[PDB]
Amino acid sequence: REIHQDWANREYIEIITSSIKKIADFLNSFDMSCRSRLATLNEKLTALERRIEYIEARVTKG
Amino acid sequence: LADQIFAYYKVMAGSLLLDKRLRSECKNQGATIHLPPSNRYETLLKQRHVQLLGRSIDLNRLITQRVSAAMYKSLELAI
Amino acid sequence: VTLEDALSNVDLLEELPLPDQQPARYIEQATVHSSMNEMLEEGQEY
Amino acid sequence: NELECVTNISLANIIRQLSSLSKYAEDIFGELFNEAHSFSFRVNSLQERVDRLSVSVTQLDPKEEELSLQDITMRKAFRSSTIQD
Amino acid sequence: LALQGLQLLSQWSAHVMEVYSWKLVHPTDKYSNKDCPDSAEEYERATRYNYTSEEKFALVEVIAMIKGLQVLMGRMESVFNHAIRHTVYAALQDFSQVTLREPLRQAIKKKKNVIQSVLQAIRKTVCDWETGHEPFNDPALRGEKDPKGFDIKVPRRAVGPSSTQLYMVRTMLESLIADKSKTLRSSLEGPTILDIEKFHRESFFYTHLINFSETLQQCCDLSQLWFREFF
Amino acid sequence: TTQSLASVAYLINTLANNVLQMLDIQASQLRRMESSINHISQTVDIHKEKVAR
């Protein structure tokens, strides 16, 4: 009967959509993590730069 | 936020180093020095994912810049 | 090329370390109902 | 079959959603690549600066140091960057 | 749990919207509020001076709780969706394959073709036969009482019924209980109609819960707190 | 439909892995730089103390 085939097809479509949602959620999580790490890296780099400038300003005359 | 955070931290630092015997004597004489109420600014300080209209804002960087400027101004004022 | 392979790929993708996150006669009724809904979508737009 | 036509339309819509997900990943990855590449430029520049500073510092001589009392304030004072976003 | 969370979020949103609307419709005045200046626009007295510090804190707390619950519920999107759809499918199949049997048998036995037609339509629209066809050994169809029996295996899978199918089934099912309808309700026993009303009242939220994300986002709408076209 | 999903997942996984590795490499290099810079600062202030003496 067509009803059983429709139910199986609705199973298939739902499984695919669930996989899509899994991927999407993972992508969002990845975006959230990567960015925090990048912020930390940027701050570390900024601290190093200023420190280097201070060292340079401290060991040069004019 | 940066201004009040800096003010609260400076007040707490100043209160920490104040002599306890002097505070007790003042309280006994009737001149109690009110303590600074506690706060939970650390949660906002540890925030790097403020999302607004699709923009990721590093609040920590701005707070760091403001506190650095305030500290430099305070040191210059002391000198 | 198979459903099982695709599901496995998704699981594999999910398996990554992501630290530092945060700090009858009813047919006529159905048709009329559909028409009413269509009219409503336009009324909301207006 | 009407039900079979529906499932095909659903599969086409699923493919379109897959493309939308592809674009939701691609834009994020491109932005991350751009910002990390800028960070890499900064790191390389500061690495050049650091090696130059080290090779300069490994040559200092205490006897070469000369202190000028008159030039102490005639000298421009150093100030750190104070850029605010 | 998902239903309770959605209901709680909706209740909180309704409370917030109601208080905001009441405050908007009842602007204050300098006579009541001393802080309000003599000169001020309608929006000023309506919103800015119409809230107390405690009221503002309560509103902020309610909003924060709403958003925290929203994010927490969203974190469990897949589990909630799977559980809801599996429960809906199991309930629908079990109902249409077991509960309608006795009523159908009674109708056939007493020659109630009007009830028989709608019951058969309901059982044909949704029921999914694991064997690929309706059983032929079922004694209910013949009208004679079942032995002692006749165990039937109901399949289990996680999928919600289509909107058209659910609406059609509900419309057929609540037609049998209709008082106005010669009333069809008068041709059914008590327990069967009671079970039918229980199922009908329980299946109201199936459509809302199937689209769990849309329902969750709708129940937490706070965008009406900024627009000022009217003022 | 089954195929395309697998390809997209594989590409995303590979790309994500590459990004993570790049970040790790950058952080490690930054840490290494921080050590050399600290050594330089130690040398500088040691020289300053020597000049004062």
Side-chain angles (χ1 to χ4, degrees), chain A residues 12 16 19-20 23 26-27 30 33-34 37-38 41 44-45 48 51-52 55 58-59, chain F residues 1-2 5 12 16 19-20 23-24 26-27 30 33-34 37-38 40-41 44-45 48:
Chain A
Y12 185 108
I16 298 307
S19 297
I20 298 278
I23 295 170
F26 154 81
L27 213 56
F30 185 81
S33 72
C34 85
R37 291 177 64 84
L38 290 153
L41 277 178
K44 179 62 173 171
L45 181 48
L48 286 185
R51 190 183 177 186
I52 267 291
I55 274 296
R58 194 180 169 194
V59 74
Chain F
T1 197
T2 189
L5 170 61
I12 292 180
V19 171
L20 285 175
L23 267 61
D24 294 339
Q26 286 208 12
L30 208 156
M33 183 176 282
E34 192 279 353
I37 297 170
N38 199 334
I40 288 163
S41 160
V44 163
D45 184 1
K48 281 284 173 279

Side-chain angles (χ1 to χ4, degrees), chain B residues 46-49, chain C residues 20-23:
Chain B
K46 307 187 190 72
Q47 288 280 334
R48 313 171 188 269
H49 290 291
Chain C
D20 299 347
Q21 291 291 325
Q22 276 272 333

Side-chain angles (χ1 to χ4, degrees), chain D residues 1 12 21 29 40-41 53-54 66-68 82:
Chain D
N1 189 25
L21 176 81
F29 287 129
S40 89
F41 278 132
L53 175 54
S54 178
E66 183 272 336
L67 270 59
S68 181
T82 60

Side-chain angles (χ1 to χ4, degrees), chain F:
Chain F
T1 197
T2 189
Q3 172 172 325
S4 78
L5 170 61
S7 178
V8 163
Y10 184 60
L11 295 195
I12 292 180
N13 192 31
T14 61
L15 193 54
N17 282 346
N18 288 354
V19 171
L20 285 175
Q21 186 173 355
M22 172 190 68
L23 267 61
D24 294 339
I25 283 186
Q26 286 208 12
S28 76
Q29 87 174 335
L30 208 156
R31 187 190 311 106
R32 178 162 308 89
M33 183 176 282
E34 192 279 353
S35 68
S36 69
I37 297 170
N38 199 334
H39 286 164
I40 288 163
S41 160
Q42 290 179 355
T43 295
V44 163
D45 184 1
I46 276 162
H47 163 277
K48 281 284 173 279
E49 182 54 284
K50 266 188 174 320
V51 167
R53 293 284 179 74

